[PDB]
Amino acid sequence: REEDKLWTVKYAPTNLQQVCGNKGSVMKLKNWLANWENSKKNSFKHAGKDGSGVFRAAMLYGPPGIGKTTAAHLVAQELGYDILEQNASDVRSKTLLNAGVKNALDNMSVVGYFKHNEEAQNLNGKHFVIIMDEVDGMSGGDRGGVGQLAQFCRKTSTPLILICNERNLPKMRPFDRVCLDIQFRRPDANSIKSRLMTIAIREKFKLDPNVIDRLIQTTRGDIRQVINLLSTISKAWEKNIALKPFDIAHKMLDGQIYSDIGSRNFTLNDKIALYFDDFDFTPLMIQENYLSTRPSVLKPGQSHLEAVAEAANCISLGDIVEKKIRSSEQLWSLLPLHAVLSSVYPASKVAGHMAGRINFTAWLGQNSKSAKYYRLLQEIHYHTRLGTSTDKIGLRLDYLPTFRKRLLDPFLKQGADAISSVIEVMDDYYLTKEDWDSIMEFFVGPDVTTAIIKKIPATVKSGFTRKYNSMTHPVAI
Amino acid sequence: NLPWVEKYRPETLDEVYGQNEVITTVRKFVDEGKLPHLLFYGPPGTGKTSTIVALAREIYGKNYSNMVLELNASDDRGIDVVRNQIKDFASTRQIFSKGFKLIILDEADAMTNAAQNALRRVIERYTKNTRFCVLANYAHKLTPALLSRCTRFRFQPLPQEAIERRIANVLVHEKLKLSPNAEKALIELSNGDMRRVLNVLQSCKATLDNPDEDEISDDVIYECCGAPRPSDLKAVLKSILEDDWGTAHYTLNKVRSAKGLALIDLIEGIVKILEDYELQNEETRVHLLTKLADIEYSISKGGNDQIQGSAVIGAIKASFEN
Amino acid sequence: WVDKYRPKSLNALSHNEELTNFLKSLSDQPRDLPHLLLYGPNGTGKKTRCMALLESIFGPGVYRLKIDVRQFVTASNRKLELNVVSSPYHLEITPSDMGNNDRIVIQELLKEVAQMERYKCVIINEANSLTKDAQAALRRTMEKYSKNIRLIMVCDSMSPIIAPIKSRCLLIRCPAPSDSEISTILSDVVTNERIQLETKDILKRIAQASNGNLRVSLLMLESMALNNELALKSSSPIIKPDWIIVIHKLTRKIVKERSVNSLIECRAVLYDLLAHCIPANIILKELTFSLLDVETLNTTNKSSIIEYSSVFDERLSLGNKAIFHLEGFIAKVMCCL
Amino acid sequence: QLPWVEKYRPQVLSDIVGNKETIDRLQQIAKDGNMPHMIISGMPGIGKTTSVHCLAHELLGRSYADGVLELNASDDRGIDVVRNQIKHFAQKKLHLPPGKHKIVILDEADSMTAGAQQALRRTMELYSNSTRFAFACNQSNKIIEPLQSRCAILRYSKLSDEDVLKRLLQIIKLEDVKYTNDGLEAIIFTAEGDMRQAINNLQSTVAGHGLVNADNVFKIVDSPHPLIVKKMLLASNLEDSIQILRTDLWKKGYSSIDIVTTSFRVTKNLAQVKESVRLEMIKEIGLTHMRILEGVGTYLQLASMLAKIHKLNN
Amino acid sequence: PWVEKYRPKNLDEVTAQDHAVTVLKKTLKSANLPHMLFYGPPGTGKTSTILALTKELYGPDLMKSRILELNASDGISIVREKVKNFARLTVSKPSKHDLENYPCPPYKIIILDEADSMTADAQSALRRTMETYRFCLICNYVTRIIDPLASRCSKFRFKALDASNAIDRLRFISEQENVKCDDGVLERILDISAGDLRRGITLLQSASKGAQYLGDGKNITSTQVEELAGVVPHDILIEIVEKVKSGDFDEIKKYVNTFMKSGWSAASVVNQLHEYYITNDNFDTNFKNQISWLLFTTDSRLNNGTNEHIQLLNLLVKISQL
C-alpha cells in the first residue's frame, strides 16, 4: 500500500544519482561492471587503464547501513542484467554451493530470456550477476563456505559481487587478491543532511538543523538508523526518546543540583536513576565533556586542574569497574557501583555551568578507526613477515619511517621515472598498491602524508598503477 | 565400606539437626499440602539435600523413585537439557499416582543468564501441575525473577548443640574414644559444617585404628585437617610483637615451613586473635586492618610469598607503635 | 637495507663473542639439544641467533621458508584456520594474532606436528603473551614429546613465565649491544654501501641516540642517509620516528602550559596517537621517560611523576580503554607540576 | 494459590505504570497501526514483555492467535529454526485490516547466538510488508550492529518510587489488606525498581504475616535490617562498628554479598550526612564489593571497609 | 637427563620424604591398598614413590598392561568410553615368573596425574567409575577437587623438603656422575632452587655440561650456577644498593636505564633486595617497616604484567627517599 510501508523501504533509492555519499566507489563499481565484457573477451589479462581488468569478481565492504546492497542492486539493474541473489538466510554450505549456484554459474537466465529479447536494448540481459550478500555472516553451520566462494571468485563466467562488513577479518583471508575490493565509508554529514531535508520536505514537517546535526552525530553515520529514527516522529521527542544521552549529560553537569538546597530537592537516588536512564552512553558522554564546564562547587582552595585530575582518576576507576562488569555479564549486581564511580562522582566534582555546547562522545569513532587500522597493520604484516622478522607492533614503530623514505620520498624529487625502482623495492616484500596506500595512511605527526599524496600530479599516480598492473611477484609458498 | 557422609545421612525429617526453624514450616507445608516452589540456600555441609530428599521420601514413600527428578550441575549443560528434560517431565503426566511431581536441582547457581531465563519460563509455564525446589550456595548468583517466583529458605550453620548431638550419635554406632578437647577443636574448626566433621572423623579413625580403641588427640586431627594450632599462632604473634626482625622472621618461616601452612590462615588466625586486644589508640586498629586486608587481597593473586610474609611482619610491627 | 646485511650463520655474527661461542658449542651436539629460552631487550638479535643456530645444526636450506594454513576445531562451532610460517626443518608460532584459543591451539598444533613422522623446532615468538593456561599446555607438551620437539622460546624480560617452564629449559640472556660494537657494525654497513662519512663521530652519536637498540640504530642510519644525499657530515640532525616527535612536543606543551585548555589539546593528541596503531604502554613509558629528562624540574616533581606513572601503568594493564588512564595520568602530572 | 504478579498483570496498554512518553508512543502506534521493528531494552522487572504483549493484543484484536509468533528462551532458536520456521511464518497469507501487520515477538534476544541473529537480517528486511519484529532484551549491547541499525531502540527507565507506590496502593485497595506506611516504605526500599519483585514481596508478606509491617517485610526478605546497618555505619567508635558487624551480622550467617549490598542501599538513602561523604563511602563500599566478588569474601575485608568508612566519617 | 636415570625406582632411595613411605609399607602386606590422594609442592617425589610402589608390587613386564598413566589433556567422552573401560578391562594373567617374585593384588592401577584443574562433572563420573570397580590421583591444590572423591581416598601430604635432608642425596649425585664442583656451590644450588628438588638436578646437569665445554676441568664456581638460574649476581646488587644508599634522582635513573638496557633483564632484583634489606643487621626497625611495605607494593604492581622498568625505577626512588 501507500501508508503501510516503512520509511526505509518507501524512500529507498531508485537510480544512481540518489545514493548519498561514496560516489567514487559507486562509479568504480559501475565502470568495472560495464567493462567486464571487454575484460572477459581478453581472457582477464590486460588491465585496462584502471587495473580492474584482471579481477573476475568484486567485493563490497564497509560499516553497516551505507548503501552497499542498494548500490549493488542498482548498478546490476541499470546495465540490464539479471540479479541472482543469495544471502545469510540460506544454507551456503560447501555441498549446497556446489549443487545450486555452481550449476547456474555460466548458464543463461530463463526469466531474462522470456522477459525481453526482441528489442536491441543490450546483449547482457541473459547474463547473470551473482550477488553473495552477508558473506561475513556465515555461521558455523556453513562448512567450507569461505573456501568454496573464494574458488568461485575464480574460474567463473558471470559478474560475481560479494558483500561483507569487515573485509580485513582473517576469515576473509582467501579473498586476498582474487577480487576487486572497493571500500565504502561513512558518508559526509552534508549528503545525509540533504537527504534528510528532502525526506522532511516530502513528508511536510520541518526540523531544526541543530537537531539534524545531533542525530547525525548520534547515529555515527548509519543512514538507515537515521531514517528509522526520524520515522518515530518536537522538543519532547528529541528530549525524551531520541537524544536522551544529551539530556542526561546536561542534567548531571548542572551546578544547582549538587548544592545543599539543590541536593535536598534532587537527592543521590535521582542522579543514579538519571544514570540508569541510559546505562550505555552516559559514561562516554561524561568522559567526553566533564572538563569543559565552569565550576561552582570547588572547595575553598581547590583549583580547576586538581578537581579535573581527581575526576579523571575516578573515571579510570570506573573504567576498570566497567571492564570487570563486561568481562562477565552475570555480575549485573555491579551496575550501581559503576554508576557512582564512572558517572556521578566526576560530574559532582566538576559540576557547574556549561561553557559552550554539549558534544557527543568521540570515543566510538576513534575506537572504530583504531580497530580498522589494527586490522590493516595485521594484514600488512601477514604479507611482509617473510622479510622483516619483526613483531606486528614493532613494525609500525620502527620500519615504516624508513618505508616512507623508500616508497614516496623518490616521487617528490625524482618525479615520474623512479617508478621501476619503487616497484622493485616493494616487490622484495610482496607489497601491493592497496598495501602502499595503507602504509602511507599510518604516518601521524609532522610526517603526515595525506596532503602530499594528493599534491602530486594524477598522471604520475596513473602511470604508477598501469606500470604495476603489468609485472607481479606475489608467490612465496 | 560406605563413607560416613552417606552412611550417616538423615533418612527422615527428625534426623536433621539445628534446623528447627525451617523444619517446623516444612512440616506445616507438608501436612497442609500447599508445598510451593522452594529455594534452599546456605553454606555448604548444612543439610539442604538431606532435608529435601527426606521430605520427598516422606511425601511419596515408595513412589519417590517415580515422581522425583533429581538433576545436578552442568552435565553437558546445553539449553537442550532445560528445554527437553524438565519441560517433558513437567508437561507429561504420571501413571498410577496422585499429586504433583517434584524436580530438585542440585547447585543450580552455576547456570548462565540464558539458562536461568529458560528455567524461570518453564516454571511460569507449568506452575499449576508441578513444583520446583532448587538448591543453591549463594542466593546472589541467581536471577531476581527466579528468586521471587519461589520462597526462600536460608540454612544457618549448625550450633554447638546439634553438632555435639551428632558426635554423640556417631559415637553410639562406632567403637571410638575421643578426648574432651578433641571435640572442642573439632567444633572450632568445623565452622558449622557437618560434612567436614564426618570427613575428618573417619580419616582420624583409619589413621589411629591400631587396636580400635586409641584416643584421638588434637594433634592428629590438626594434621589430617591441615589447620593451624592456637599455640603456634600465639607464639608467632608474640615473636612478631616482641622480638627483633631476624628472630621473628626466622620463627615465622620455621612455623609456616615445618608445618605446611599457607599465609591465608596465618593472617586469619592472627586477626582473629588481635580482635579482642585492649588497644589504646584506634589508628593502630585502622592501619592493622587496612594493611592486612591489602595483604590478603594480594595473596589471593599469588605473588612472592616471602615478600608478603615480610610485609605481614612489617605491618604488625608498624601498627603496634602507638 | 637492514635485512640485506643480516648474519645467516654463526660465523657471520660480529657481536657478543661469548654468546656466539656458546652457540657454536651447543651446535656440536645435534643428538641432544635441550629446550632454550632466550630473553633480553628488543632489538638485540635473538631471532637471528635462533635462525643461525638452526642454520648451523641443519643445512643452509633453513632460511627458505613458506607460510601455510592449518585448521582446528574449538569449543564453539567456529573452526579456526590459522597461518604458520614454517621451514623444511622448523616452524614459528606467534600467539598474538589469537587471544583466548592459546591453550587449545598450542597443544593441538604441537601434538599434530609431533606425529607427522631427528626432530623439528618450534620457535615461539613473544613467549610472554602466553596466559598461564597456555604455559601449562606448553609444559605438558614438553613433558609428553621430548624426542621430536625442541622448543626455542623467544621472549623479553621473562618475569611472566611459570617456574616449571624455567626448570625444563636452558635460560639464555642477550645483553644489548654496547656503543662500541654498534659503531663497528655501522661502519661495516657504511663501508659496504659506499657512504661518504665525514667523521667517525656520527656512528658513536647514532649508537648513543639509539639506546642500545641495534635494529633501530640501523633503521635510523638508513633513514638519515636518504636525506643528506648519502653524505653524512658533522651537521647531522638526528631524526626520530614519526611518533616520538609528537610525544616530545606533548611533553614540552605539558611542561610549558598547565591548564585544562591545554588538556583538551593533549587529549586530541592522545586520540591521534592511539588511533594510528600505537599501544598505550609504549606511549606511557615514552611520556614518563621524556618528562624525567627535562632540566626545569626538581627532584620532588620527578619522584611524584614516576609514582603516578607506576600507578597508571598498572591501571592501563588492568583496564580496556586506554585514553581514560592516559588522560588521568596527564591530569595528575599537570596537578603535581 | 495464585501469584498476584500473574493475576494482576496488565492486559490493556493504559494499565502499565512508569515510563510515560514511551507508553504514549506505543498508544499512538496501536492507534495508527504502522508499527516498525523495535528493540525494547531495560532493567529486569519493569514491564518490557507485558508492554509488547498488550501492544500486539491491542493491534491484532481477534487475530492474536493467528498472526503472532512468540519465541522466548524456553524454545529452540538456532539457525535451522530462524531459517525454516520464521521464514515460513513471515510468508504466510493473512487478511488483516489495512493498518495491522503480523508480529514476531522474540524475548531475551540477547541469548540468541550471533550466527542465528545473522540469518534474520534479510528475512526481516524483505518481508517488511507483512511482518514486524519486536525484540525484548535486557542488554542492547549483545545485539549485533545490523539488527540495532534496522529496528528502533526503545529504552525503559527504572521505576521511580511514587509510581510503584501508586501501583501498590491500587493492589492493596483491590485486595483489601491492612498495611502501614513504613511497611510500604520497606517494600519500596527492597524493590529498587522491580515492580514484579515488589508485588511478589507484598504478596508474600500478606500471606505470611497478614499485616504489612516493616518488621515482617525485613523478616521475610531475609536481608540485613537497614536500621542495624545504619547503626553499624554511623557509629562513633570503630570498635562499636566492628562488634556490631561481628555479633549481629556475621554470626547470624548472612552472606558478605548481602551485607555489602545492604550497606550500599542504606548509604544511598542516608539523608543526614552530606553528599561528598556519601559518595566517598559508596566508593569504598564498591571497592570492597569488587574485592569480594573476586573470590575473597573474608570477614577481614568487611572489617577493613568499616575501618575506612569510620576514618572517612571522622 | 639425570632426572630419569637416577629417579627413585624403589621405596628406599627417597630420603627427603619419610613420613609417607612408612605408612604405605605398613599397608603393603594387606590387599586393602585403598584409593589415595597425593598432594604437595611440585618436585617432591610423588610420582617417584608411585612408580616405585607399582614396580615393587606388580612387576616389570606388566608395567604397561595393568598400570595406566593418565594426565590433563584438553574429556568426558574419555572417561565414559576409555577410562571406565580401562577400569573394567579384564586384568591380564600374571605369568608364573611374575608370581615367583611379585605378589599380585586382585585389582588394577590407574594413575591420573594433575587432578587439580579438572571439571566437576568429570569428577562426578570418575568417583562412580572408581567405586563400582585402584586409583592414585595427584594435584597440588586440595581445595579445587570435589569432596565426594576425597571421601573414599585417604589423603597424604607430601611435605616440601628442608635444606637438611636435601644435601646428601645431591652430594651422592656429585659422586655418581664424576662432576667436579667448587666448595660453596651445593648449598647455593639448594637455596636458588629452594623447595623443589628436580630443578636443582637440572641446574646441576646444565652447569656440568656447560662447564665441560670449556675443557678446563676446573671447579664449577658459584657464579655459573647463579647465571644459569637467572638470578642477579651479588656484585651488581652491591652496585645497586650502593647507588641507592646515597644518590640523586638523575644517577639512579641513568643506572636503572643501563640495567634495564644491558644488565640482567630479570625482575628478580626485588627478591634479592628484600633478602638483603631484611636479613641485614644495620638498619633499624622504622626503616625495615617501610622497606617491607614498599617491596610488597612493588611486587603487587609487577604481578599484574606491567612494565618492569617503570616499577623498578619507582621502587628504587622510593627506597632512596627514606
Ligand SMILES: Nc1ncnc2c1ncn2[C@@H]1O[C@H](COP(=O)(O)OP(=O)(O)OP(O)(O)=S)[C@@H](O)[C@H]1O
Ligand atoms: N546512500 C543512501 N541514501 C539513502 N538511503 C540510503 C542510503 N544507503 C542506505 N539507505 C537506506 O538504507 C536502506 C537499506 O540499506 P542497505 O544498503 O540495504 O544496508 P546495507 O548497506 O546492506 O548494510 P547491511 O547489509 O545492513 S550490514 C535503504 O532502503 C535506504 O532506505
Ligand SMILES: Nc1ncnc2c1ncn2[C@@H]1O[C@H](COP(=O)(O)OP(=O)(O)OP(O)(O)=S)[C@@H](O)[C@H]1O
Ligand atoms: N543437618 C544434618 N544432620 C545430619 N547430617 C547432616 C546434616 N547436614 C549434613 N549432614 C551430613 O552431611 C552429608 C552431606 O549433606 P548434604 O545435604 O548433601 O549437604 P548440603 O547441606 O545439602 O550442601 P551440599 O551437599 O554441600 S551442596 C549428609 O549425607 C550427612 O551425612
Ligand SMILES: Nc1ncnc2c1ncn2[C@@H]1O[C@H](COP(=O)(O)OP(=O)(O)OP(O)(O)=S)[C@@H](O)[C@H]1O
Ligand atoms: N509498569 C508496570 N505496571 C504494572 N505492573 C507492572 C509494570 N511493570 C511490571 N509489572 C508487573 O511485573 C510483571 C512482570 O513484568 P515483565 O514485563 O514480565 O518483566 P520483564 O519486563 O519482561 O523483565 P524480564 O522478563 O524479567 S528481563 C508483570 O506481569 C506485571 O504484573
Ligand SMILES: Nc1ncnc2c1ncn2[C@@H]1O[C@H](COP(=O)(O)OP(=O)(O)OP(O)(O)=S)[C@@H](O)[C@H]1O
Ligand atoms: N626424595 C627424592 N629423592 C630423590 N630424587 C627426588 C626426590 N624427590 C624428587 N626427586 C627427583 O625429582 C623428580 C621429580 O619427579 P616427580 O615425582 O614427578 O616430582 P613431582 O612432585 O611429581 O613434580 P610435578 O609432577 O611437577 S607436581 C624425580 O624424578 C626425581 O629425579
Ligand SMILES: Nc1ncnc2c1ncn2[C@@H]1O[C@H](COP(=O)(O)OP(=O)(O)O)[C@@H](O)[C@H]1O
Ligand atoms: N651479529 C650481528 N651483526 C649484524 N647485525 C645484527 C647482528 N645481530 C643482530 N643484528 C641486527 O638485528 C636485527 C634483527 O633484530 P631482531 O632479532 O628482530 O630483534 P629482537 O631480538 O628484538 O627480535 C637484524 O636486522 C640485524 O641487522
Ligand SMILES: [Mg+2]
Ligand atoms: Mg545488505
Ligand SMILES: [Mg+2]
Ligand atoms: Mg547436599
Ligand SMILES: [Mg+2]
Ligand atoms: Mg521478559
Ligand SMILES: [Mg+2]
Ligand atoms: Mg609428577
